[PDB]
Design a protein around this ligand. Structure first.
Ligand SMILES: [Mg+2]
Ligand SMILES: [Mg+2]
Ligand SMILES: [Mg+2]
Ligand SMILES: [Mg+2]
Length: 121
RNA sequence: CACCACCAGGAGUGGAGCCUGCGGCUUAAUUUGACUCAACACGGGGAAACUCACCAGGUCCAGACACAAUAAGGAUUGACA
């Protein structure tokens, strides 16, 4: 439970339609006040998705949430991309790089837990 | 036995001009069914479009669902001039 509970803050976020999944979507979404928590890959390739979304979320005003995690293929199952098959093993999905969140669909204590790790260590 | 037969009759039709239905001819198409009574102002069929089925052209999917493929560093949709 050492900071891999970001799945459950994302999973309750999806049920209240609050993930602007996708490089195009996220970049559009976080170029407004919608940017509420952001999740990034470490690096996929060629370093420029890494440059681009970081510079937009590093604006000179308060809107700087940023969380740095591992490769994208896991991350799509960490978000909602449907591969349930009513819990069956089959992965029919792809992996996203940048998920930006709006409104997080919840009141979770893990939601309480997560920002504090984002704030204090 | 019977004016969907005759008798004694009446009013006609068949002639004419138009209206309408069928065959034919023509047509890109002149959509089609029904040929004695028991087909032919019949399909309640008096069709400008629609009806509409025919002809000449142009859109759309309104091809459920399942399994594969594709694919959030975009599977696909819409459009101003
Ligand atoms: Mg006459
Ligand atoms: Mg007729
Ligand atoms: Mg007729
Ligand atoms: Mg037709």
């Amino acid at each position: 439970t050492i900071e891999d509970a970001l799945k459950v803050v994302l999973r309750t976020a999806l049920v209240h339609d609050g993930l602007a999944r996708g490089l195009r979507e996220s970049t559009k979404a976080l170029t407004r006040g919608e940017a509420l928590l952001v999740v990034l890959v470490s690096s996929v390739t060629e370093a420029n998705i890494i440059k681009l979304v970081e510079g937009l979320a590093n604006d000179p005003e308060n809107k700087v949430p940023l969380i740095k995690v591992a490769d994208a293929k896991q991350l799509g199952e960490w978000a909602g991309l449907g591969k349930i098959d009513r819990e069956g093993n089959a992965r029919k999905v792809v992996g996203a790089s940048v998920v930006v969140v709006k409104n997080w669909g919840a009141e979770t204590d893990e939601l309480s837990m997560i920002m504090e790790h984002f704030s204090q260590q």
